[PDB]
Each structure stands twice: as C-alpha cells, then as structure tokens.
C-alpha cells in the first residue's frame, strides 16, 4: 500500500478496478485482500484528482463495472459491506449521486447503477434502510441530490417503479386503480414537505442560489401538482386576506399623513374634537405597523443568517419593507424630539409604502410575470447603463463648471441637474447669457447630447437581444419559485394546529413489508388519461 | 419662524428676507446675499472685435450667435 | 400599475408641499402626469419649505416611470 | 488604412495629449484661450475611461457594441441627415432673411432643436411669407421622424 | 486565415513507430473517466521572427477569420 500523501491508501484492488481487469480482482480477493481499504491520498479527495468514495466498492460502482460490484458484495471469501462509510461520511449511494453531471449518458448510467445497487442491497439485507443513512452533513441521497442540483437523479428518485416480488416496497410510485383510457397513480411523498431535518421543498426553496438548476427542479411531476394543490386549498385565502389588511393599513396611513397639522414645533396638543381623535387614532395605527414590520424583518434575518451576499440577490422585499419601517421609526424619534424634519422622513416611508404593494402581484400570474420582468431588467442591465452614464455625466459636468463659473454653473450639483434635464428632454438651449467662453460651450453641449443619445440607443438595442425566447421562458419559472417560497413561508408558522397542509392520509400502499408489519405512506393522488392502450 | 443668513435653508424652513437673501441649489444650501449689479467696463471686447472665444462683449454691446462672432451694438 | 404608482407619489407630494399647485390631489396628479409626456416643469423657482427633498422625490418618480415604460415596450416584443 | 479602421484608443489618447500640450503652449504665451484647450483635454479624458472596460467580461461586450454601432451604422445616417438638414436650412434662410434666420448657423441650430424635442412652433413673429414657413417646418419635422424610425428599425434588423 | 489547416496542425496527433515525434498533442496520464493531455506550444509564444499569437493579433484586418482563429483548442486556454 502506498504511504505517500499523494497516493496514500491506494492498494492493488483500486488498480485492478482501474484497469477493468476481473482476473486480478478475483486473485486479490482470493488471497485475502482487504476490500474495505480506503484510498486516502490527496489524488483521491474531493485541483487534480478524482473522488469516488475512497473504497473499491464505490470505485467499481462509479466506473460502471457492474460485474465487479456483484462479485464484491457476494464473494465467499470476504463480501464487502454495503453500508460502509468513507472519511467524509458518504456511502456508495452518496458517491454515485456525486458523480452525476446531468448529461444524458451519465444520467442513464447513474440511474441504472443506483437502481441495481439498491435492489441487490435490499435482497442481501432486507432489514437495512440503506437509503436513510445520512452523511456527516446530515443529508440523505435524495436531500444531497436536491441540494447539489442533480436534477437528473432527483427526477428518477421521486418517481421510481420497481415491479419485482419482495422489492415493490422500495418504489415510491404506484397505481391505485385503473379503468380503460383513465387511471389513477399514487405517489409516496415521504420527506418531501415535513421531515424535521431537511425536506426537498425546504432544500430547493432556501438554497444559496448557486445551484444551476434551482428553477428547474420544481418542474417535476409531483412537486408542481403538490404546490398547486397547496395554493388552491388554504393558502390563497390567507394571502388575499393579508393583501386586504395591507391595503387598509396604507389607506389609514395616507389619510393620517394627508391631514397633518400645519403648525410648527411638535408634539401637538390633542384637541377635544372628533376629527382630531380620528387623526390621532390614525397616527397610532400608522406607527404600530412600522413596529410590526421592524420585528418581522429582524425575525427573517435571525432564522436564515445569509452570508452578506444573497441579501441583494434574493429576498429583496424583506429589505424594502425593513427600510420602510426604519423610516417610520426615525419619523417617530424626530417627532418626539421637537424637530420639524420628521415630515421629511414620513413622506419617504409613505412614498415607498405604495411601491412595496407590488409585492402582492404574486398569486396573480398575469401580473407576477410582469413584475418579475421589471425586477430582472432593473437588476441586470440598467445597473451597467447607470454606471457608464454617471461616469460620463460627471466628466462633462466637471468640464462645464471649469469653463463657465457663474450663472447656474458655479457648482457641480446644479450643473449635474441641468445636464441631466437633457436626458429627460427639457433642456435650456437658449445661450442668451453673455459668457466669456460662448461658442465653446455650445460644442460641449452638442457633443454631450449626441453621445448621450448614442448611449440610450445602444441600451435599447441591447435589451432586444434578450427577447428571443430568453426572458419569456425564464420569468415563468422564477414566478413559480416565488409562489413556492411564499407558500412555504405561510405553511411554516401557521400557529393553529396544522391539519390542512397534509396529503391524502395514512393510505395502505402495500401492507406487506419484509416482516409481518404493514405500511402507510401518506400518499398523493394524481389521475391520468392515456389513449395509447 | 424662518432661516437667517448662514443657516441651512430648504430642509424644513425658508429664508424670510427674499429681497436681500436667496437660498441656493447646493444640496445643503445656506442663504447668502445678492451681489451688486456692477457693469463690465474692462477686460471685455469692443465693437468690431471677436466675441465668445475667451472674452465677453462689454456692457454696452451684445454678442451674436455664430461660430466666430463679433461684438455689435444691440438695437 | 401606473395609476397606483402615480397615486402614491401624488399623495406623498401633496403631503410634503401644501401650497403652490400642490395643495390638491387633482392638480398634483395632472402636474405629475405631464412628466410622462415630456412636458415637465423642473424649474424650482418657488421657495418651498422642503426643497431638496421635493427634488429627490421628483427624480425618483421620473426614473421609475421611464423604467416602467421601457419594460412595457420590451414586454410587447414577446407578441411579435 | 489600418489606423482608420483599427487601434482607435491609441489615437484618442494621443489627441488628448495633443490638447494638453497646446494648452501648455497657450498658457506660457499669455493667452487666456488655453482654457478652451484644457477643458477639451478634460472632457474626453473622462470618456477614455471606457478603454478600461476590457478585462471585465460584462462591460467589455457592452463597450464593443457601442463602438461597433457607432462606426458601422450611425455614420450613414449622419451623412443622410446632415445633407437633408443643410437643404432645408438653406431653404428657410432663403425664405425668411431677417430675425433668427438671417444666418445659416442659427437656422441649423434652430432646426436641430426639433430633433431633440425642444422646438419652437409658436409662430408669433409677423413674417412676410408666413403660412409657407409653416408648411416647410411641418414637412421637415415629419421627414425627420420618418428617417429616425427607419434607422431604428434597420438597427433592429442587426440583432 | 486558413483556419481549417491551422486547427489540424496545432492538434496534430499520430501513434505510429518512428512518427510519434511529429505529434503536437500528447497524453501525460489517465484515470478511469479523466485524462490529462499536453500540447506542444513551441513557436506560438516566442519565435523572434514570426509567432502565431503575434501574426494573428497584429494582422492587417484583411484576414477573413482573424476573429475565429483564437477559438482553437490550445490558444483559448493559453490566453486565459
Ligand atoms: C422612493 C424610492 C423607491 C425605490 C423603490 C424601487 C422599486 C420598488 C419595487 C418593489 C417590488 C417589491 C418586490 O417584489 O421585490 C423585488 C425587488 O425589486 C428590486 O429589484 C429592488 C431593487 C432595489 C423582487 O425581490 P424578491 O424578494 O422577489 O427576489 C427574487 C426572489 O423572490 C426569487 O425567488 C428569485 O430568487 C429572484 O431571483 C429574486 O430576485
Ligand atoms: C469631446 C468629444 C469626445 C468624442 C469621443 C467619441 C467617442 C469616444 C469613445 C471612446 C472609446 C475608446 C475606445 O475604446 O476605442 C474603441 C473604438 O471606439 C471609438 O473610438 C469610436 C470612434 C468613433 C476601441 O477601439 P479599438 O482600439 O479596441 O480597436 C478595435 C480592435 O481592438 C478590435 O480587435 C476590432 O478590430 C475592432 O474592429 C477595432 O475597432
Ligand atoms: C441622477 C442625476 C441627478 C444627479 C444630481 C446629483 C449630482 C451629483 C452631486 C455631487 O456630486 O456634488 C456633491 C454633492 O454630493 C451629494 O450631495 C450626494 C450625491 C451622491 C451621488 C448620487 C448619484 C445619483 C458636492 O456638492 P455639495 O452638496 O457637497 O456642496 C455643498 C457645499 N459646497
Ligand atoms: C448639428 C447641428 C448644428 C450644425 C451647425 C453647423 C452649420 C455650419 C454652417 C456654416 O457654414 O457656418 C460656418 C462654418 O461652419 C463651421 O464652423 C464648421 C462646420 C463643420 C461641420 C460640422 C458637422 C456637424 C461658421 O462660420 P460663421 O457663420 O460663424 O461666419 C463667421 C464670419 N467670420
Ligand atoms: Na420628447
Ligand atoms: Na419636450
């Protein structure tokens, strides 16, 4: 066995499997070779190298050497332990999931090998829950596949069928009844929504957004119908109720702010008259909502702890609502400090308080796609455009101020505003003032206008290249992901003795486990029609 | 109440004496006085001399719109 | 979408400045609408109490409405 | 031929340096017009910041699109538009020879203002050939917008 | 700009006796699903007379495929 740190742990069995030579494998096993030897060199760790699980069994599985896999588990001299663990904490199934790359041929290979190994393991050890062995992180193979974006493996696992005696219990897709063109399938969705460790919906929804297939993994057959069933059952009414309450809050806030007193030096004494009682009631109901949003926006952060990168990538609306509440609190502090500037804060919390109403466009598909498109274009293209435009504007403003130092151009701020007005289309090309450097100023302004229109035209044309079957398809998956996230957020708390989140109930699926016990699987019913029969 | 000379105007209060002070546009404005209307008599171009390129026409003349303008007496 | 956005910003402007063509919701709505068709009045000749906040509100309104119009235009290209 | 078609950034940096040197010469010659040079050296000196967008994957392609569309497409529209503008400007100067239209430079600027939405169709002045002037201005405006729309769609033909 | 011949030459490979020295693409080592090749870049980076990178980069712009020649297998990673 190699002792060098690069090849540490490598032995003859690993080379024999590498060479795809069964003769040396048989000879090594016959001579008492240790089938559990681990290749712990840097070359085999998860840079150059190849990670396979460090064990000959997972090496044979990962190299599509099925005959060696069958021999190793069943040879008389020393059969291999199907439940063995590597230094990381993974087993054969975890390593087999890891080598997937969502290509067609590799997906086919991984699926076939996974099914064959699971069936053989069940046959050799009927009492072994091979699929429920967690690694060091605490993930099962399904959770690992969902976390890493192995959509090809997830799509197989969630709807596998095994039609063999003493192996049907391994499957999780069944048939309840059949008629002619119509039949009814029955999916087992254990550990899809509620498992108390890490469910598929939880791991997909709350991932880091680094996963390349984060948006596609919700398009599989059981999850899309589960989410649509959840929405149409109880969540829709809750969302509409919350939207109604927010609308009432904004109406009260707007009415209270509109009729503010005009006298200076707050706070203002309460008059013993009806209108002022209504006004102060409105003010109290306006401040309480800010307190609520402040606490909810803290509770979001504490229960997620993003690493300061995804804050501006996902969950922007949490930041916007939090900023609204911060402005409200600053308004309160300035109000009771006898300052008149509180109005300046208050209107800001009003002005954005309406724009955050776009958060409630989701749930209505026709508006949700539109809102997703707005957010996509803002965060993608207009940031580059604004960066270039602002540098260009600063350059020309400092050019103009240097030339004309009086008459609206004696400061950088005023010059910037006057130049920005041209982009809107409200310029002041009059040239009536008796400047020292007239007939040079004109050239600067004409060059500025031409370059700015070239930039705007370039921006507009560049935005047309993303309309060719790019935005239209992407926005729908993004909206579906948003609806999934809000459904999960609503289901998570609910604080009212959850019953309505549950599926069809404890239906007897097979009733004949490997032992004499029965089974109940908490299934989901999906009807289907097929005329090719 | 209103802001006085040197105080920050337009952030909640304007200046009172508008006939002598104005609130500028500088994002933190301070009210300051109007400058006197002093006519231009020196370092300026006379009638018939080149205007625009580095020298304004004196107070008694006007500058036409052209690539190479010359000072003229306004009508 | 545009009408809700316009109503929100109009109420904010009326709250901030209770005089000088901004003392009512109808007049403020018309004055803000005129920006959408290129007929604005970004002059700032009047002595408001809260100038330099009013400027920020107007700039934000104009930028957001032009983003909305550009988004509408681009979205209409999905039909052709 | 190579310089006119490639290696533009070297030319722009060289022109910036030339403006700086002319500013120095005018400064020590006791001329105030050195300021007119210096500002130009400043004004393009910021624009050449675009040179450093390369190396960055996202901005470099945007800059390349800007430069390619400037050199390829807009230089034909410039020619057509300028010839059209000169023709209508000379017609207007011929028709109305006194007051904001007695010179070709002012008439060209006043007609250009329409292209950027800041025109003047008040028609307060009592000209001798008013109601012919109106027809010329309307025809110019309509043809200008037709040319611009055609340019825009031709640029949609390259995406 | 004859990219069809350049792509062949830069990736030339032969496994015949007394001819392997003519190859530019070789293999250093291999494992089950992974292997490591190595390209001969002689006369690409430095010649002192005429190198591939210099003759492509500093071409007259009349060359038809001057944009595409840099996409061949070794240069795309060499420049990166
Ligand atoms: C006075 C001055 C006002 C300024 C206000 C400016 C407009 C406000 C508009 C309010 C809209 C509220 C909203 O709906 O928030 C928008 C944020 O709009 C912005 O871009 C703000 C830029 C700053 C979407 O944020 P979201 O939390 O949905 O994040 C998405 C996830 O949901 C999803 O799962 C995906 O991961 C997706 O990739 C994520 O993006
Ligand atoms: C006060 C008044 C200011 C006026 C300023 C006018 C705009 C300035 C824009 C500044 C941009 C600087 C820059 O970066 O210059 C740009 C060119 O844009 C222009 O200048 C347009 C002038 C019309 C890059 O040109 P480049 O040297 O990269 O040559 C390219 C090759 O490299 C490449 O391999 C290809 O062969 C390609 O066909 C070649 O082009
Ligand atoms: C989007 C188009 C319109 C833009 C209008 C602003 C032009 C840029 C402003 C400027 O750069 O000027 C600075 C002031 O910076 C600021 O206020 C903060 C602005 C931060 C950049 C925001 C970019 C959108 C110096 O001016 P002072 O206020 O400090 O002078 C007073 C005392 N002598
Ligand atoms: C894009 C809208 C604005 C276009 C404006 C141009 C109208 C050109 C008409 C004119 O011929 O104007 C003459 C000469 O023109 C010039 O300077 C140079 C023109 C170079 C072409 C520029 C292409 C954009 C100026 O000389 P003066 O009239 O000032 O006579 C002084 C008497 N001692
Ligand atoms: Na316009
Ligand atoms: Na206009």
From Swiss-Prot, chain A:
Residues 466-494 are annotated as: AD. Changing residue 307 to A: Largely reduces PMA enhancement of capsaicin-evoked currents, but no effect on direct activation by PMA. Loss of activation by capsaicin and loss of vanilloid binding. A motif (Selectivity filter) lies at residues 425-428. Coiled coil: none annotated. Disulfide bonds: none annotated. Channel activity is activated via the interaction with PIRT and phosphatidylinositol 4,5-bisphosphate (PIP2). Both PIRT and PIP2 are required to activate channel activity. The channel is sensitized by ATP binding. Repeated stimulation with capsaicin gives rise to progressively smaller responses, due to desensitization. This desensitization is triggered by the influx of calcium ions and is inhibited by elevated ATP levels. Ca(2+) and CALM displace ATP from its binding site and trigger a conformation change that leads to a closed, desensitized channel. Residues 303-315, 362-376 are cytoplasmic. Changing residue 418 to K: Abolishes channel activity. Restored channel activity. The modification Phosphothreonine is found at residues 175, 486. Na(+) 1 binds at residue 425. ATP binds at residues 7-10, 18-19. It is a multi-pass membrane protein. Changing residue 352 to L: Reduces binding to resiniferatoxin. The modification Phosphoserine is found at residue 307. Na(+) 2 binds at residue 425. Its main location: membrane. The keyword Transmembrane helix applies. Predominantly expressed in trigeminal and dorsal root sensory ganglia. Expressed also in hippocampus, cortex, cerebellum, olfactory bulb, mesencephalon and hindbrain. High expression in the cell bodies and dendrites of neurons in the hippocampus and in the cortex. In the brain detected also in astrocytes and pericytes (at protein level). Isoform 1 and isoform 3 are expressed in brain and peripheral blood mononuclear cells. Resiniferatoxin binds at residues 316-317, 355, 362. Signal peptide: none annotated. One of its GO terms (molecular function) is monoatomic cation transmembrane transporter activity. The association domain (AD) is necessary for self-association. This is Transient receptor potential cation channel subfamily V member 1.
UniProtKB/Swiss-Prot annotation, chain B:
Expressed by the venom gland. The record marks 11, 27, 53, 67 as: Interacts with TRPV1 (reaches into the void formed by S4, S6 and pore-helix). Keywords: Disulfide bond, Ion channel impairing toxin, Knottin, Lipid-binding, Repeat, Secreted, Toxin. Coiled coil: none annotated. It comes from the Eukaryota. Disulfide bonds join 2-16, 9-23, 15-31, 44-58, 51-63, 57-71. One of its GO terms (cellular component) is extracellular region. Residues 2-71 are annotated as: 2 X approximate repeats with cysteine pattern C-C-CC-C-C. The record marks 25, 65 as: Important residue for activation of TRPV1. GO terms for molecular function: ion channel regulator activity; lipid binding; toxin activity. Domain repeats lie at residues 2-31, 42-71. It is found in: Secreted. The keyword Ligase does not apply. Interacts with TRPV1 (2 toxins (4 moieties) bind 1 channel (homotetramer)). The presence of 'disulfide through disulfide knots' structurally defines this protein as a knottin. This toxin contains 2 'disulfide through disulfide knots' that are separated by a short linker. Bivalence accounts for irreversible toxin action. Selectively activates the heat-activated TRPV1 channel. It binds to TRPV1 in an open state-dependent manner, trapping it there to produce irreversible currents. It binds to the outer edge of the external pore of TRPV1 in a counterclockwise configuration, using a limited protein-protein interface and inserting hydrophobic residues into the bilayer. It also partitions naturally into membranes, with the two lobes exhibiting opposing energetics for membrane partitioning (K1) and channel activation (K2). Belongs to the neurotoxin 23 family. Double-knot toxin subfamily. This is Tau-theraphotoxin-Hs1a. It comes from Cyriopagopus schmidti.
Curated annotation (Swiss-Prot), chain E:
Phosphorylation by CAMKII seems to regulate binding to vanilloids. Phosphorylated and modulated by PRKCE, PRKCM and probably PRKCZ. Dephosphorylation by calcineurin seems to lead to receptor desensitization and phosphorylation by CAMKII recovers activity. It comes from the Eukaryota. The modification Phosphothreonine is found at residue 27. It is found in: Postsynaptic cell membrane; Cell projection, Dendritic spine membrane; Cell membrane. ANK repeats lie at residues 1-15, 50-72. Predominantly expressed in trigeminal and dorsal root sensory ganglia. Expressed also in hippocampus, cortex, cerebellum, olfactory bulb, mesencephalon and hindbrain. High expression in the cell bodies and dendrites of neurons in the hippocampus and in the cortex. In the brain detected also in astrocytes and pericytes (at protein level). Isoform 1 and isoform 3 are expressed in brain and peripheral blood mononuclear cells. Belongs to the transient receptor (TC 1.A.4) family. TrpV subfamily. TRPV1 sub-subfamily. Responses evoked by capsaicin, but not by low pH and heat, can be antagonized by capsazepine. The association domain (AD) is necessary for self-association. Non-selective calcium permeant cation channel involved in detection of noxious chemical and thermal stimuli. Seems to mediate proton influx and may be involved in intracellular acidosis in nociceptive neurons. Involved in mediation of inflammatory pain and hyperalgesia. Sensitized by a phosphatidylinositol second messenger system activated by receptor tyrosine kinases, which involves PKC isozymes and PCL. Activation by vanilloids, like capsaicin, and temperatures higher than 42 degrees Celsius. This is Transient receptor potential cation channel subfamily V member 1. The chain holds residues 344 to 423 of 838 of the full protein.
């Amino acid at each position: 066995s190699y002792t060098d740190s690069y090849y540490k742990g490598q032995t003859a069995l690993h080379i024999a499997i590498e060479r795809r030579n069964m003769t040396l494998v048989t000879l090594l096993v016959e001579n008492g070779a240790d089938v559990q030897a681990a290749a712990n060199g840097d070359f085999f760790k998860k840079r150059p190298g190849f990670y396979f699980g460090e064990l000959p069994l997972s090496l044979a599985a990962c190299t599509n050497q099925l005959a060696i896999v069958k021999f190793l588990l069943q040879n008389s001299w020393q059969p291999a332990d199907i439940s063995a663990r590597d230094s990381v904490g993974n087993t054969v199934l975890h390593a087999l999931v890891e080598v997937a790359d969502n290509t067609v041929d590799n997906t086919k290979f991984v699926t076939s090998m996974y099914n064959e190994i699971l069936i053989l393991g069940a046959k050799l050890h009927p009492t072994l829950k091979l699929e429920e062995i967690t690694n060091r992180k605490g993930l099962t193979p399904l959770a690992l596949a969902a976390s890493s974006g192995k959509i090809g493996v997830l799509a197989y696992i969630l709807q596998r069928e095994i039609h063999e005696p003493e192996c049907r219990h391994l499957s999780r897709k069944f048939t309840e009844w059949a008629y002619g063109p119509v039949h009814s399938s029955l999916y087992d969705l254990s550990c899809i929504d509620t498992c108390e460790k890490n469910s598929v919906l939880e791991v997909i929804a709350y991932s880091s957004s680094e996963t390349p297939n984060r948006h596609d993994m919700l398009l599989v057959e059981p999850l899309n119908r589960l989410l649509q069933d959840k929405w149409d059952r109880f969540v829709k009414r809750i969302f509409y109720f919350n939207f109604f309450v927010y609308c009432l809050y904004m109406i009260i806030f707007t009415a209270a702010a509109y009729y503010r007193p005009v006298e200076g030096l707050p706070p203002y004494k309460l008059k013993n008259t009806v209108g002022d009682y209504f006004r102060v009631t409105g003010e109290i109901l306006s401040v309480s909502g800010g307190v609520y949003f402040f606490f909810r926006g803290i509770q979001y952060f504490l229960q997620r702890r993003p690493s300061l990168k995804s804050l501006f990538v996902d969950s922007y609306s949490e930041i916007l609502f939090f900023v609204q509440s911060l402005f409200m609190l600053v308004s309160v502090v300035l109000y009771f400090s006898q300052r008149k500037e509180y109005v300046a804060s208050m209107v800001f919390s009003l002005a954005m308080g309406w724009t955050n109403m776009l958060y409630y466009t989701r749930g209505f598909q026709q508006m949700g796609i539109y809102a997703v498109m707005i957010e996509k274009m803002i965060l993608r293209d207009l940031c580059r455009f604004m960066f270039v435009y602002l540098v260009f504007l600063f350059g020309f403003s400092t050019a103009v101020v240097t030339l004309i130092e009086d008459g609206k151009y004696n400061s950088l701020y005023s010059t910037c505003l006057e130049l920005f007005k041209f982009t809107i289309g409200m310029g002041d090309l009059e040239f009536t003032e008796n400047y020292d450097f007239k007939a040079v100023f004109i050239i600067l302004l004409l060059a500025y206008v031409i370059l700015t229109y070239i930039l705007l035209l370039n921006m507009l044309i560049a935005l047309m290249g993303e309309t060719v079957n790019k935005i239209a398809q992407e926005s729908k998956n993004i909206w579906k992901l948003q609806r999934a996230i809000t459904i999960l957020d609503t289901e998570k708390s609910f604080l009212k003795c959850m019953r309505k989140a549950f599926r069809s109930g404890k239906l007897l699926q097979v009733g004949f486990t490997p032992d004499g016990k029965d089974d109940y699987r908490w299934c989901f019913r999906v009807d289907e029609v097929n005329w090719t029969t | 109440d209103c802001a006085k000379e040197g105080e920050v105007c337009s952030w909640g209060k304007k200046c009172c004496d508008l006939d002598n002070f104005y609130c500028p546009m500088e994002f933190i404005p301070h009210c300051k006085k109007y400058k006197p209307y002093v006519p231009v008599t020196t370092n300026c171009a006379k009638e018939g001399e080149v205007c625009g390129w580095g020298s304004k026409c004196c107070h008694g003349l006007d500058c036409p719109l052209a690539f190479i303008p010359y000072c003229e007496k306004y009508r």
